[PDB]
C-alpha cells in the first residue's frame, strides 16, 4: 500500500486498523550500551513488529508490516523469518513474493538475508526459470558480487542448468579477463561437467589460459588458474610447460612466471627428477631473486621456501 517515504505514510501508532494492539517497546535495560538513537519512524515500526511477533499474529496486517520493517533494516533476520512463517500461514502467492525479493535484492545486493529468502522461495516453488537471468542482471552491476555467484552456483547445481554456463563465463572473461570470480566459475563448470581428466579438455584449458597470459602477462588470475588445473597431478608431470615458460622468461620475467618456475622445480624435486642438484640450485637462485628483487613483499615466504627446499632435497 503505502511506503515509508510516501507522502501519505502514517505511523502505526496512528493507524485505526492497528489501535486494537498495544506496541511493545524494546527493553535495552536501565543503563543502555551501544544504544542506537532510532528515528521516530524506525521505532514505531519495530514497536509494532515486536507486538505481532510476541503475540505470534499470523495476519495480513502483520505481513504488510514486515515489508516496512525490512525497508528500515533489511538485515533483520528475525523479521525475514517471521515473514516466511506468514507466507506459508497465509498461503501468499510465491510468484508475487519473487517479484518482491527481486526488487529488494536489486536495492541491497550484498545482504545475506535477501539472498537466502530468494533461495527459500525457489526451493518452495522448485522453479529456477528466472534465476540465471536475474543473477546476470545483478552481475551486470557488480561482476564480483559474492552472494550472486554463490546463489548462481547453487541454482545450477541443484537444478542441473550447466548447458550454457561456460558460454556465460567466456562472455564475462571477454569483458574483464581479470575477474577472478569468473575464473572460479570456469573451474566450477568444467569440474562438474566434463571434468579435467579428459586430456582433450585439459589441453584446451591449458592452451586457453596460456593465450590469456600472453595477452595480459601480469593478470594473476590466469596464472592461478593454470596452476590450479595442474597442481593435483603435479606441475612436474607437464615437461613441455616448463620449456615454454623458460622461453618466455627472458621477455616476460614477471614475478608470476618466476614463481611458477619455482613451483615446478619444487614438484620436480618431490618426484625424484633427474639432475636433482641442478634443479635445486636453480630453484634456490629464483627464491633469492624473488625475495630480494622481484617479489619483495613476499620475502619471508620465499626465504621459507628456500629453507624448505634445502631441508627436503640437499642430500
Amino acid at each position: 500500500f503505502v511506503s515509508l517515504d510516501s507522502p501519505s505514510y502514517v505511523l502505526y501508532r496512528d493507524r485505526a486498523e492497528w489501535a486494537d494492539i498495544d506496541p511493545v517497546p524494546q527493553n535495552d535495560g536501565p543503563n543502555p550500551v551501544v544504544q542506537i538513537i532510532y528515528s521516530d519512524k524506525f521505532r514505531d515500526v519495530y514497536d509494532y513488529f515486536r507486538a505481532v511477533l510476541q503475540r505470534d499474529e499470523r495476519s495480513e496486517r502483520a505481513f504488510k508490516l514486515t515489508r516496512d520493517a525490512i525497508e528500515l533494516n533489511a538485515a533483520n533476520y528475525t523479521v525475514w523469518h517471521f515473514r516466511r512463517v506468514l507466507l506459508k500461514s497465509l498461503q501468499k502467492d510465491l510468484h508475487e513474493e519473487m517479484n518482491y525479493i527481486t526488487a529488494i535484492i536489486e536495492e541491497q545486493p550484498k545482504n545475506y538475508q535477501v539472498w537466502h529468502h530468494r533461495r527459500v522461495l525457489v526451493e518452495w516453488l522448485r522453479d529456477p526459470s528466472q534465476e540465471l537471468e536475474f543473477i546476470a542482471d545483478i552481475l551486470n552491476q557488480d561482476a564480483k558480487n559474492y552472494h550472486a555467484w554463490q546463489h548462481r552456483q547453487w541454482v545450477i547445481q541443484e537444478f542441473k542448468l550447466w548447458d550454457n554456463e561456460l558460454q556465460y563465463v567466456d562472455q564475462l572473461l571477454k569483458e574483464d579477463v581479470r575477474n577472478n570470480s569468473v575464473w572460479n566459475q570456469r573451474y566450477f563448470v568444467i569440474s562438474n561437467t566434463t571434468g579435467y581428466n579428459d586430456r582433450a579438455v585439459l589441453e584446451r584449458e591449458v592452451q586457453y589460459t596460456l593465450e590469456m597470459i600472453k595477452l595480459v602477462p601480469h593478470n594473476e588470475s590466469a596464472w592461478n588458474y593454470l596452476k590450479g588445473i595442474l597442481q593435483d597431478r603435479g606441475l612436474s608431470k607437464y615437461p613441455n610447460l616448463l620449456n615454454q615458460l623458460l622461453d618466455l622468461q627472458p621477455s616476460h620475467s614477471s614475478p608470476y612466471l618466476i614463481a611458477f618456475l619455482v613451483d615446478i622445480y619444487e614438484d620436480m624435486l618431490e618426484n625424484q627428477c633427474d639432475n636433482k642438484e641442478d634443479i635445486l640450485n636453480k630453484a634456490l637462485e629464483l627464491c633469492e631473486i624473488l625475495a630480494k628483487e622481484k617479489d619483495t613483499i613476499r620475502k619471508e615466504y620465499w626465504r621459507y621456501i628456500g629453507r624448505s627446499l634445502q631441508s627436503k632435497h640437499s642430500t
Partner: protein, 410 residues
C-alpha cells in the same frame, strides 16, 4: 645508522615505485579501479616523506579511544542498519579498547553484561538485540565480548545448557551449520560454533562430526577457502575455515601448501595491505582476516615439525602491513577505515587494529620477537589468532569453563 627521530619506510624506498600496477596496456574495470587506488595511496605515502627526513609513524590512540568510548554508549541513527548486530558493536568496540590497553570501567562492564543478557534467547544463543531470534554471528560476538570483560559475572551470563542445545539445532548431516533457524549455510557458522563451543567447554564428540570434512571441501583450486564448496577463495571465509579447523585440531584436512601460497599472495605489493580476493582492492579489515592466517599456519606447520619455519617472523611483510594501516587507515578524528576516501566505522576500527597487533607481535614456543613500527607507544596488546581476543582472556575463560561439566554429557 639512523637517528632515533627518523625511521626509513619500506613504502618510501625508491624501488617501491616499481611495484605500481603493470596493466600490459589492456584496461579492464579491475585494472582501472586498482590504478585509481594506487594513485591515491602514493599521494598518501609521499605526505609522510620529507626527502631524507622520515618522522616516526604515530597511532592516534587518544583519538581512537574517545571515538570508541562514545560508541560503547550511544550511536547515531546511521547505525540503524546494524540494529540486528548490537553484540557485534559490543565486541568490535571492547576488543578495540582491549588492544589499545584502555581500561573498561566496572560500571560499563556490568552494563554490557546486562545488555548481552537481554540479547540472550531462551532457546539458547544470542540475537542481534533484545527479543531477536538467536543467530551464530551475534552469539560469537557476545561470547567474545563477555570473555574480554572476563569477570565471573560476565562468564555466568552464558546459559551453557541452552547454548549447546541451540548448536545442535543448527547442525546439518553434511557437517555444516545453519547461521540461525531457517537460515543460510556457509563456513562462518562452523567457526562461530567452534569458537563459542570451545571457549565455554560444551564440545561433545558428535557436535562437530563431519564438520572438518565439510570445511575442507570449501578449500578450492586457488588454495584459499570459499563460503561453501565450489565458491571463490575469500579472506574472511578462509579465516573462518582455518580457525575452526585449528580449534578442532584438524588443520591437516587442508592442503596447507596451497593455502599458504594463496594467502601470502593476497598482500598487495604496492599498498602493503591485504585484499580479500585475488584481483580485488586493498581493504584495512583484511589486515586481520588475511594476515591472521599466518600465525595459524605457523602453528599448524610447527605442530608438524616443519624444520624450515622462521623463529622470528610471520610469513608476510609485517612492516609493510603496519605502514599501510598507520599511514592509510587512520581517521584523523578517531577510528580506522578501509582505505583513504572511506568513512570510519567500528568494524574497521576493530580489525585494522587487530591486524596491526598481529603484524607487531611474533610468538612461537619460547620465542618472542616484536616489530613495532613508529613511536614505541604504537605497541598494541597481543591478540589470539583463533578467537581474536586477548590471549590472556582466552586462557582465563577456557580455564574457568573447563571447571564446569559439558551440559548433560559425560
Amino acid at each position: 645508522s639512523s637517528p632515533v627521530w627518523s625511521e626509513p619506510l619500506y613504502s618510501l624506498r625508491p624501488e617501491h615505485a616499481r611495484e605500481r600496477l603493470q596493466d600490459d596496456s589492456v584496461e579492464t574495470v579491475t585494472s582501472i579501479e586498482q590504478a585509481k587506488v594506487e594513485e591515491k595511496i602514493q599521494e598518501v605515502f609521499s605526505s609522510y616523506k620529507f626527502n631524507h627526513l622520515v618522522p616516526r609513524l604515530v597511532l592516534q590512540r587518544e583519538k581512537h579511544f574517545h571515538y570508541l568510548k562514545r560508541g560503547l554508549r550511544q550511536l547515531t541513527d546511521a547505525y540503524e542498519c546494524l540494529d540486528a548486530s548490537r553484540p557485534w558493536l559490543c565486541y568490535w568496540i571492547l576488543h578495540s579498547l582491549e588492544l589499545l590497553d584502555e581500561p573498561i570501567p566496572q560500571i560499563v562492564a556490568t552494563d554490557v553484561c546486562q545488555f548481552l543478557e537481554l540479547c540472550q534467547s531462551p532457546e539458547g544463543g544470542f540475537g542481534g538485540g533484545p527479543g531477536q531470534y538467536p543467530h551464530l554471528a551475534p552469539t560469537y560476538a557476545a561470547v567474545n565480548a563477555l570473555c574480554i570483560i572476563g569477570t565471573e559475572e560476565a562468564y555466568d551470563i552464558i546459559n551453557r545448557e541452552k547454548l549447546l542445545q541451540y548448536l545442535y539445532s543448527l547442525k546439518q548431516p553434511d557437517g555444516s551449520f545453519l547461521m540461525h533457524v531457517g537460515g543460510e549455510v556457509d563456513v562462518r557458522s562452523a567457526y562461530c560454533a567452534a569458537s563459542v563451543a570451545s571457549l565455554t567447554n560444551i564440545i561433545t564428540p558428535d557436535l562437530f562430526e563431519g564438520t572438518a570434512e565439510w570445511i575442507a571441501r570449501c578449500q578450492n583450486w586457488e588454495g584459499g577457502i570459499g563460503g561453501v564448496p565450489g565458491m571463490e577463495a575469500h579472506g574472511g571465509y578462509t579465516f573462518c575455515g582455518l580457525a575452526a579447523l585449528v580449534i578442532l585440531k584438524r588443520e591437516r584436512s587442508l592442503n596447507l601448501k596451497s593455502l599458504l601460497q594463496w594467502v601470502t599472495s593476497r598482500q598487495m605489493r604496492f599498498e602493503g595491505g591485504f585484499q580479500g580476493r585475488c584481483n580485488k582492492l586493498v581493504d584495512g579489515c583484511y589486515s586481520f582476516w588475511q594476515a591472521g592466517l599466518l600465525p595459524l599456519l605457523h602453528r599448524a606447520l610447527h605442530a608438524q615439525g616443519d624444520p624450515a619455519l622462521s623463529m622470528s617472523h610471520w610469513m608476510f611483510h609485517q612492516q609493510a602491513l603496519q605502514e599501510y594501516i598507520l599511514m592509510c587507515c587512520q581517521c584523523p578524528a578517531g577510528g580506522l577505515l578501509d582505505k583513504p576516501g572511506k568513512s570510519r566505522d567500528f568494524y574497521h576500527t576493530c580489525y585494522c587494529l587487530s591486524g596491526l597487533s598481529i603484524a607487531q607481535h611474533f610468538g612461537s614456543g619460547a620465542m618472542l620477537h616484536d616489530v613495532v613500527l613508529g613511536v614505541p607507544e604504537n605497541a598494541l596488546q597481543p591478540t589470539h589468532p583463533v578467537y581474536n581476543i586477548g590471549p590472556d582472556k582466552v586462557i582465563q575463560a577456557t580455564t574457568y569453563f573447563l571447571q564446569k561439566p559439558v551440559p548433560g554429557f559425560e
